Amino acid sequence: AFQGAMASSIDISKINSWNKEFQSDLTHQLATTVLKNYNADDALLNKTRLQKQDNRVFNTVVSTDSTPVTNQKSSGRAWLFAATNQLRLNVLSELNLKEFELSQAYLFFYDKLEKANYFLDQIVSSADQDIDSRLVQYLLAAPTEDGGQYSMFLNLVKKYGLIPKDLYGDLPYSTTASRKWNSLLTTKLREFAETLRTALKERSADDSIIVTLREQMQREIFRLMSLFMDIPPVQPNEQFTWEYVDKDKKIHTIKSTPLEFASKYAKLDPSTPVSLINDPRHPYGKLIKIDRLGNVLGGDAVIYLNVDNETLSKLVVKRLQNNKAVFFGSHTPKFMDKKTGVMDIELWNYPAIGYNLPQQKASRIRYHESLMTHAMLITGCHVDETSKLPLRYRVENSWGKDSGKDGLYVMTQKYFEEYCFQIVVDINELPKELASKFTSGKEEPIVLPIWDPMGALA
Amino acid sequence: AFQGAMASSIDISKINSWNKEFQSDLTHQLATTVLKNYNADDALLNKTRLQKQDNRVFNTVVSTDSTPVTNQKSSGRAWLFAATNQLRLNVLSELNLKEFELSQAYLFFYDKLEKANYFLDQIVSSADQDIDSRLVQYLLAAPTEDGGQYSMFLNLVKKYGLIPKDLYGDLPYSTTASRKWNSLLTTKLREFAETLRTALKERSADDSIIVTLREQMQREIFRLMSLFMDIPPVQPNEQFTWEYVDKDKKIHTIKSTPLEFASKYAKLDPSTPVSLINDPRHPYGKLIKIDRLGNVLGGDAVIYLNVDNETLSKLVVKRLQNNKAVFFGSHTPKFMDKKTGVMDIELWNYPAIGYNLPQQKASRIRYHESLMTHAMLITGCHVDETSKLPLRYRVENSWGKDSGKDGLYVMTQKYFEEYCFQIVVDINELPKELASKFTSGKEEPIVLPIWDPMGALA
Amino acid sequence: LFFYDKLEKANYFLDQIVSSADQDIDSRLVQYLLAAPTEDGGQYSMFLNLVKKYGLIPKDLYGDLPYSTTASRKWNSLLTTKLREFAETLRTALKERSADDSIIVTLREQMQREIFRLMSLFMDIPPVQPNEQFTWEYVDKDKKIHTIKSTPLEFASKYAKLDPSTPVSLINDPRHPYGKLIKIDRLGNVLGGDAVIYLNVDNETLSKLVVKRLQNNKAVFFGSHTPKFMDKKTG
DSSP states (O other), X not given: OHHHXXXXXXXXXXXXXXXXXXXXXXXXXXXXXXXXXXXXXXXXXXXXXXXXXXXXXXXXXXXXXXXXXXXXXXXXXXXHXXXXXXXXXXXXXXXXXXXXXXXXXHHHHHHHHHHHHHHHHHHHHTTTSOTXXXXXXXXXXXXXXXXXXXXXXXXXXXXXXXXXXXXXXXXXXXXXXXXXXXXHHHXXXXXXXXXXXXXXXXXXXXXXXXXXXXXXXXXXXXXXXHHHSOOOSSOTTSOEEEEEEOTTSOEEEEEEOHHHHHHHTSOOOTTSEEEEEXXXXXXXXXXXXXXXXXSSTTOOOEEEEEOOHHHHHHHHHHHHHTTOOEEEEEOXXXXXXXXXXXXXXXXXXXXXXXXXXXXXXXXXXXXXXXOOOEEEEEEEEEEOTTTOSEEEEEEEXXXXXXSTBTTEEXXXXXXXXXXXXXXXXXGGGSOHHHHHHHHSSXXXXXXXXXXXXXXXXX | OHHHHHHTSOOHHHHHHHHHHHHTSHHHHHHHHHHTTSOHHHHHBOHHHHHHHOOOOOSEEOSSOOOSOOBOOBSSOHHHHHHHHHHHHHHHHHTTOSSOXXXXXXXXXXXXXXXXXXXXXXXXXXXXXXXXXXXXXXXXXXXXXXXXXXXXXXXXXXXXXXXXXXXXXXXXXHHHBOHHHHHHHHHHHHHHHHHHHHHHHXXXXXXXXXXXXXXXXXXXXXHHHHHHSOOOSSOTTSOEEEEEEOTTSOEEEEEEOHHHHHHHTSOOOTTSEEEEEOOTTSOTTOEEEESSOOSSTTOOOEEEEEOOHHHHHHHHHHHHHTTXXXXXXXXXXXXXXXXXXXEOTTSBOGGGGTOOOXXXXXXXXXXXXXXXXXXXXXXXXEEOTTTOSEEEXXXXXXXXXXXXXTTEEEEEHHHHHHHEEEEEEEGGGSOHHHHHHHHSSOOOOEEXXXXXXXXXXX | OHHXXXXXXXXXXXXXXHHTTTSOTTSHHHHHHHHOTTOSOOOHXXXXXXXXXXXXXXXXXXXXXXXXXXXXXXXXXXXHHHHHHHHHHHHHHHHHXXXXXXXXXXXXXXXXXXXXXXXXXXXXXXXXXXXXXXXXXXEOTTXXXXXXXXXXXXXXXXXXXXXXXXXXXXXXXXXXXXXXXXXXXXXXXXXXXXXXXXXXXXXXXXXXXXXXXXXXXXXXOOOOOTTTTOOTTTO
């Protein structure tokens, strides 16, 4: 015990001796001088590399421009923005509009209301477990967080449809600075969780007292939501009229319902999108399910089909060639230079200070180093003339026109392979052997915990 | 010829081969990455060194504080500020004042008028030389420049005295942004120079036409000066009354003249100050004279007594122990960190990028690398307990309270030895063998050109 | 062009020092050489000198990324301090030896290497050599992608349309007779390159040439006394 603990301790002579040796090295002397003065990323950004990688020529792009660049501001709504950014191109194109956005706020309101409701159910169903359990504590950590998955986006569209941002936008303070609202709701939900668990010690979930309690809680949650944002102006099957001007300055009027608008104008058929992921911790060709992660009670689960990078990459190119943008999930902001808008794992000269990272992808995920954190949209790529393989991708972010280069980012193929994980394509775009995994029946998914790194995107 | 020129040319293969070799070196790889991102001084500032050198404890200081810190702003008046900063301590002390300044603007007005006049005389006296000559071209380069030497400061005080800044301060735009005024005057003086030389081709300098011409030029120069600053409110032997409040809030009134004020209150006896310099290009113990450099026609010349650093340094300490601050000239801003206010030749880690400078002091001066550029004031120093030698000096700059640390700088002994050159002390402070050089008679000074690096201070 | 101009000027300075080693350190010429050896400014003849040796390339391949391209003062100071040290070393070695001496030849090579070493810390040597091919991808006004494979030297002629043997500088310098050529002694960058030469003409001629060039659809490079009588806010 003693000898071991002594050997494993920090010895003052040892570190001072190592210091003397390091100081004899000129690269070290230069590095410590520079790194005490500037942030490592600022100090190490490699302009020799930047000069070559910052390349905005893309020979494979979607025909419609992303106008205007969107901005989620201080909220974790990237999944909603990226999903709607893929669809708005259909509208911009079909209707010949200069600028257009589907309402991100519309989906945000319902997502939050549904998540708060979903939490009550999750608490009721896990009431048998101790308050200190990993699951119960995880449920209580961030019940109304903004982030989400593509399955949760479809869950919302199926119930609520889509509407032009013109009818309901980011006017409220809480759409662009959601933290306080989330805190207020969450404090209340944590109180509610205790009230339910307490009533459930004695009673059954189907008991009238519990049924009543939950109704009262739903009402209070809705009451508090409505103080920070208004319930959308039309119900899902209710008609709205939208007046707009096209590129030729011609006025048009559309009368539709949110549910009809999603199909008819946004062109979304909820039964076609499927998510593919490169999660090397698991065998390829297997479906992966994230237990519990959701928003609408009883809605679809988060499911991904695990495939290799060659397949993921080939699907992205084919989708772009088919004139459709690609929703993707990645580890933002790892190796991302926000000022130039370049995503390149070699853009900073870390090897020059002897900082090298051998840990492979599957292990980075397992060891808490890398996870999906943000959703963006691939709108173009450059396929090398000689290799017929993609070298870089054009990425539409939702951080406003000042982020990156006019709101757009350029990502290397290597970045895509290492720090990106999920893409969303339509099932008919898949080779029949991959499509089968979804339509087959009895492809038993590998079930991961609700807290898995391959989760929600903000 | 050919082979030599070829050998002395830049060869593309050679530089690309050297590039390949340099890139194999890790220190080089790190250096080029960092140096393409930040200014070298910002990148290389050594905080390990800063931590030790930025030391404001001084065991040897003058008794009176420099209140308030002065600011020359965008003008080259440092010589005037430093000279008056040494004297104002006498007034602050004697009169028990919280804050006080002698008028820097007062001296500035007369200095500029005198220099413009001095230029006309210099042109008349060198009319025998070609317009393209080194002297004539040098005279035409900056006839009304702000900078000056200590002898020029005394020349002004002897003729004009000194007055409280309360009677005449930096109100005019041109006192704090003198460039335009200087340009306007200089353009006119360049016209005048041609007019005089032209009239002198035919006539003698003592000719009535020339005498008249010069009078008309003086009048026009004064006319233009008076548009940018007012002539001081009282003549040198004219009485003024100055009302002020002391530290105990007591009101006092002083009636004096600028000439009496300089002696009586500022305590300046113009016959006592002498400049010593460490100019290793010349033998020590020799007087050095800068040919022509001056302001008042027929005034004293710039003369320095050349001595070694041990002597220069011993004189600074003794003067501070005698409770007097020390005017000094140095090469600002070589090795000066304006943000922290530290003057240290090792504060930046240039050796880490293999940038070393073996050129010695005398050679730096000869080779156009180092010269006197700015005047400041030593107000304290720290004499090492063990060595009984100074380690650092407390320097009062005239760049406002925001420069350095509350307007003050700390300078190492090595900085003083290498990038400082001149100090001003009183003749009675000198060993009789050094004092003799001045009072002796027939110590023939080494005469240097008007453009010598050991010149005016701005 | 900036990278090569500075490297060439630093090299040119060493040669200027070696050739004027017979003069006193305090001389007007030697002091002038030591004042600003790596200054940024230059003449049109120095621009052609560079293009003839190095060609031209799209900014897309090498732009103003480095700090020193847009704030060159510090870099210039650092190089200049070193060059001033080198000047003394050469003059000292030359007191004893002849310029063609092996010691001097070697010394200069070592100095060139150190100058290049220091240059490369602040900017990278361009990505392609003058006769080396590069590929440049770009998008035209119709959003069409194109790829050009060329060399800097071929690009200067083929795409930039510069034939270095055609440009000449005319000047209105009334200190001298019109119709006379004026040469500025020594001013240059590339050792042994063309000298700065101007043909002195009157304003009526200068002005008539500017109009005719514009009518021929070509812009006109000109030198003037900035910012005399220039209002920067209104332009």
